């Protein structure tokens, strides 16, 4: 996270850390949507151009963390993956369209003050909150600049108009993506950065006071560049795939 601030304890209890077994290293963020399911960005797992393809055996999920590097005894819980599912139509060849993956925990995790699932938006929640100018929140242990925090970082960013998104880049943007970030004129900065991939973009419903995961940290051209914006997976649009995979 660039230009963020240290999170408060328990501020983002669905925050997950994807952690490589060997070498030991933070792979990406993720999110806890049930006691057995973790949501993240497919590119955290599979990115052929860079020779990346992680399997179940390669990783661990660390839940309930605050500190980036300490083993938080008695606080954090570490789980093994049973199965990874990548969207059948994730487009790694061109624009990371459909950048989404589900991970099934080997055993259900027990909830605590530090471990709690975020909600998945409904059509009307999406309708209502996913509007230009409205602010969401991103969290993660990623680089502080395009610079490794000691604790979880947070920043709040406004969703940006589609046309402004489209006109900031040469990449073909799809309906499965949304961008977020301040404008150069705006007098405020912030962005996700490397190590933040796969984390949650959340919003708090003014109707039911619940936190919903609207986005997944997806791609961006660098980190915190003027006139550029962070791109996020549009969770609601892929909600049917999610369901489908948890039902089946």
């Amino acid at each position: 996270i660039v230009e963020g601030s240290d999170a408060e304890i328990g501020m983002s209890p669905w925050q997950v850390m994807l952690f490589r077994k060997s070498p030991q290293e933070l792979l990406c963020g993720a999110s806890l949507i049930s006691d057995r399911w973790v949501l993240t960005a497919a590119h955290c797992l599979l990115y052929p151009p860079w020779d990346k393809n992680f399997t179940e055996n390669d990783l661990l999920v660390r839940i309930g963390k605050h500190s980036r590097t300490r083993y938080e005894r008695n606080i954090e819980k570490i789980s093994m993956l049973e199965k990874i599912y990548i969207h059948p139509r994730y487009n790694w060849r061109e624009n990371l369209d459909r950048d989404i993956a589900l991970m099934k925990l080997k055993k259900p995790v027990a909830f605590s003050d530090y471990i709690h699932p975020v909600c998945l938006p409904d059509r009307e929640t999406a309708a209502s909150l996913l509007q230009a100018g409205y602010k969401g929140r991103v969290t993660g242990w990623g680089n502080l600049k395009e610079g490794q925090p000691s604790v979880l970082q947070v920043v709040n960013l406004p969703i940006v108009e589609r046309p402004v998104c489209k006109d900031s880049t040469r990449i073909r943007i799809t309906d499965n993506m949304f961008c977020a970030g301040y404008k150069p004129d705006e007098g405020k900065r912030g962005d996700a950065c490397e190590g933040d991939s796969g984390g949650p973009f959340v919003m708090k419903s003014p109707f039911n006071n619940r936190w919903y995961q609207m986005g997944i940290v997806s791609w961006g051209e660098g980190c915190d560049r003027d006139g550029k914006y962070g791109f996020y997976t549009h969770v609601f649009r892929l909600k049917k795939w999610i369901q489908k995979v948890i039902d089946q």
Binding site: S5, E8, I9, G10, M11, P13, I33, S112, D113, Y114, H116, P117, V118, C119, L120, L129, G133, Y134, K135, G136, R137, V154, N156, P158, M203, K204, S205, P206, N209, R210, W211, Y212
Partner: peptide, 26 residues
């Protein structure tokens, strides 16, 4: 139960910046 944090919503405490989100919504 989703999306209600044990240390905040469940105790009626607010985090230090969630007001900033709410104020942008309308």
């Amino acid at each position: 139960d989703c999306g209600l944090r044990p240390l905040f919503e469940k105790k009626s405490l607010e985090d230090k910046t969630e007001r900033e989100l709410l104020e942008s919504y309308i």
